[PDB]
Design a binder for these strands. Structure first.
Lengths: 75, 97, 83, 95, 109, 95, 109, 97, 83
DNA sequence: TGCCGGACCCGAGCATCCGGATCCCCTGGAGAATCCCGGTGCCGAGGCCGCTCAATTGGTCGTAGACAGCTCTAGCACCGCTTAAACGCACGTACGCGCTGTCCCCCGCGTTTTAACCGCCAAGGGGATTACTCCCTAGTCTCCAGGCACGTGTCACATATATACATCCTGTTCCAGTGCCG
DNA sequence: CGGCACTGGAACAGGATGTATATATGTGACACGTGCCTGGAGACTAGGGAGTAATCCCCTTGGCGGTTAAAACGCGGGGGACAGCGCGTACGTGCGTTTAAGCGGTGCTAGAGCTGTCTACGACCAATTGAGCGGCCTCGGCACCGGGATTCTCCAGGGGATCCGGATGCTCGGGTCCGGCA
């Protein structure tokens, strides 16, 4: 079963904490290495990361939308 | 809801239809208008065999068709489907024209 | 007596018909006039030598046999009009 | 009346009934064929003319023509044409 | 007292007029002398190419159930044959159309 | 005994000295020039032979070359060559 | 008894041997007769083209500061004349090289 | 540090150098060996004028650099600086080979 | 006498020199072998016809004038080799 | 016989499991375009006849080229050196490559227009044809002079080498934005 | 919120290296003088290809009306083109290294190339005829028309799936069960 996608993307972004934000490609590779159906839930995880950006829990670093980089919030 | 096809599919059917068909696609009377327009620029009051104009047409749109497959190959080869004039310019250069 | 604009008699439905027979799917709006100019250039290239043919053949009527010559010295060899 | 205009339509139509006894012909296709055969005739005769220039030879032989056939024809067309013309030359030699 | 005149085409057993083509060669401004067997040979190979193209065109016309040859099947014969197409790459056909050629990248999902 | 071979390199050299008395030339450059002369010669000669063959002409005059060059030459080169050959043939005709 | 041998090139004021031109026409078998002014016109337009191309070669050589012209001077002369490039596009030149042509997309920034 | 020119600087310098120079670039002996090898495929017992061999080398190199410039402008159209043989095949096929 | 592998008689750096003369800036590794095939096709054609010339010339040595014929019959015309 | 603490059973917490909201996916409804089957009327194609003109036979004869022979020449083959380039690999970076966000441009479907096409008709412009006659040029004769071959020498030019500048990349200093504390 | 430490980002200096130049030195291949002859030229003749006169007819161009399917514009919206980000690899470049082409010398010959011979085969002309060409006819295959079969293609919608939030129930701790205790 597993948790909802918010859990997985939060450890995807919190796995490394690079100086710049984690890119969409790097977080996709992280979720692939940890194990998740990125093949089919790609629209699902894109709307999920869009949701977490809109909730303000996550902040997009460089790009807008799914492109660019993403990092954790201030506090 | 009224019937409406998605874009390109009717264009694909047109491609198929026209690749089977062999007839001229321009209205011919403007083509003789162009022929006499360009011809009077070299010598005025020249008369024309209609067969001469038909040969001019067949050669003309034949050259244009071959240019169009080359243009389509250029449009695809730059990772696209839509043609732009840079396809035409590249085709003209590589054809030695 | 003179002729001023028949190049805009080249209808963009005819251009796109040749594009479909030429296999072109999506066409920009700026294509039409440039192809008109290019084919027009081709037309003077043929008909200049065709005029020279009819002049050297001492006629005032253009025939298809001179058209055969005019296509063939650029190697655009068309069959069914020679004879 | 008018002057006689020579055509290959009789000869090509004979060849047609040799290979396809069933089918008919259009006049437009036949004009295509005549323009074709006259074109390729003047082609092969032209390269034979240049061969006569390069060999400095006054009389045109079949040897030069078979050579020009290897110049024009693509591959197995050239070999089969050489074979068929060879047999035709032999039975013409024996009349 | 002259013997019965055969034709050189009959002497080769062929269809094309040897006298006509040899006359074309002589008045073509190509050479003053032309050997006897060369026009015979040329008529033979013209017969070969004629029968080849005509046979393929008749087969193509039979494919689309018509018993009278049209320039469309002439184009289909000349362009689907790579030796013939390469031989006549610079050759235009009237009302023959083109080979139907659709790019698979143009095809939708 | 060597077989005398006709080449235009002396004529090319005198043409060069006409246009530039101060200028020399290499032997391979003269070979290029002779190749150019022969190339344009065979082009114009074959074209004139064909134009004679079309209008059933058996005698070649400068009119036919004038037509054939104004075919083969585009732009101002055709007009200037026609003019210059016209003066040359004209004052030859007076000669 | 007989007139002085006077050359037809001098009569036409020309340099190229019009007799040699006319002889090569006769051995070229282009027609069974040739009018008198035809090889004259041939010769004359050949000095015209030759003068033009050698003018271009001289321009290149003075630009290339060498007294004797070389095939590189020939290439550099001919290939900036685009009118000749319509005339002689299908012509290759021995040791002529190519026009130095670097595109702005190859240039940085 | 020891110096290292950034990529493209040296390449453009050799482009300038060889657009300046006129001479043949491939070694003549292996090309000659290839000529003999290819001619052996048709008929044995063949000798070779050297002038024929240099003519073949010059014509071949000119043919190659011409199609190189063609594929160059094709890759320029295709928004790339790295040439791949798909460009070469497209240039041949549109050119007619 | 007997030769086998002059396919690699063209070296890669020779191709890079030609490509710099050809104005090419960045060259893939896949380029060289495809160009090798293309040049093989071109030389097989022209040298086959050169052999046809020389057997028609009844010679056991080829001449450069045969090469002139081989370049001219597709109009790849070269000057300065006995033409 | 009432009284007070121990334990437990009742309320709270919070996790937990689906309730419904919502996004994607597969297959059927709908629509329509297109192939297949005759029907009809038609118009060019094939067959025939008559008529011509050039293929053919026959002869001659002259010369084009195949062969025989002699010569002599670059190609071919070997070899000894011999440095220029070929190869090769290793770090580095930047360019293809690929995903995504956005936007508006052009395929599609409509209304409106309009001139192309039929087709019908005349006029007449010039092409095409035969004939006539002669200007010129191929063929022949005899004769000469510049072109090619060949020799010979000699300066335009490559190469060498030492100077002088262009430029390319990279360290270094000045300066403004951000981040985190005052 | 401000202010200064931290960090990025741009301009510039400077060196090293290629790029370009100046001149010294063979140099051999350009460049130019001559022997000869064989093709260029002068003249004669033939005689015919071709320039022009005449014709006529026929094929080209224009005009008139009508119509209709093509074409032209509005909307419009989605999908492809483009923008942008980020990355990973595959040459770029920059060394060592192997070889191998190249240059120069020697020795050979097959075979190209030039010339005598002759001889057979093609050009040229009298006779002629029969096969090939032009016109017409008739017809039968074929193009347009009409109707249905077929098949593709696009959206509607119910089902799978998933996730924030109430339900819920078992768990986790305190008034009420429960029994000794005074």
């Amino acid at each position: 079963s597993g948790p909802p996608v918010s859990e997985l993307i939060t450890k995807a972004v919190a796995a490394s904490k690079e100086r710049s934000g984690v890119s969409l490609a790097a977080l996709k590779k992280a979720l692939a290495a940890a194990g998740y159906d990125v093949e089919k839930n790609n629209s699902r995880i894109k709307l999920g990361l869009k949701s977490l950006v809109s909730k303000g829990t996550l902040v997009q670093t460089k790009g807008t939308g799914a492109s660019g980089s993403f990092k954790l919030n201030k506090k | 809801k009224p019937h409406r096809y998605r874009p390109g599919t009717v264009a694909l059917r047109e491609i198929r239809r026209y690749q089977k068909s062999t007839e001229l696609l321009i209205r011919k009377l403007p083509f003789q208008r162009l022929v006499r327009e360009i011809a009077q620029d070299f010598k005025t009051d020249l008369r024309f065999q209609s067969s001469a104009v038909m040969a001019l047409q067949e050669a003309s749109e034949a050259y244009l068709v071959g240019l169009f497959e080359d243009t389509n190959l250029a449009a695809i080869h730059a990772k696209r489907v839509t043609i732009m004039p840079k396809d035409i310019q590249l085709a003209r250069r590589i054809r030695g024209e | 007596k003179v002729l001023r604009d028949n190049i805009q008699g080249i209808t963009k439905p005819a251009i796109r018909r040749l594009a479909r027979r030429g296999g072109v799917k999506r066409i920009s709006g700026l294509i039409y006039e440039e192809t008109r100019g290019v084919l027009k250039v081709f037309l003077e290239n043929v008909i200049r030598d065709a005029v020279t043919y009819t002049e050297h053949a001492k006629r005032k009527t253009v025939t298809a046999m001179d058209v055969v010559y005019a296509l063939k010295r650029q190697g655009r060899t068309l069959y069914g009009f020679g004879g | 009346k008018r002057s006689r205009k020579e055509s290959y339509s009789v000869y090509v139509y004979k060849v047609l009934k040799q290979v396809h006894p069933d089918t008919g012909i259009s006049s437009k296709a036949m004009g295509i064929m005549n323009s074709f055969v006259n074109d390729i005739f003047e082609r092969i005769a032209g390269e034979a003319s240049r061969l006569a220039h390069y060999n400095k030879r006054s009389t045109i032989t079949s040897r030069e023509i078979q050579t020009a056939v290897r110049l024009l024809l693509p591959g197995e067309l050239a070999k089969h044409a050489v074979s068929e013309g060879t047999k035709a030359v032999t039975k013409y030699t024996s009349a | 007292a002259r013997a019965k005149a055969k034709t050189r085409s009959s002497r080769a057993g062929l269809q094309f007029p040897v006298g006509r083509v040899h006359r074309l060669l002589r008045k073509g401004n190509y050479s003053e002398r032309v050997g006897a067997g060369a026009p015979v040979y040329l008529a033979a190979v013209l017969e070969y190419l004629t029968a080849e193209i005509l046979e393929l065109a008749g087969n193509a016309a039979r494919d689309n159930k018509k018993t009278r040859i049209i320039p469309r099947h002439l184009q289909l014969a000349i362009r689907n044959d790579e030796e013939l197409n390469k031989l006549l790459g610079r050759v235009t056909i009237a009302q023959g159309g083109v080979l139907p050629n659709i790019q698979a990248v143009l095809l939708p999902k």
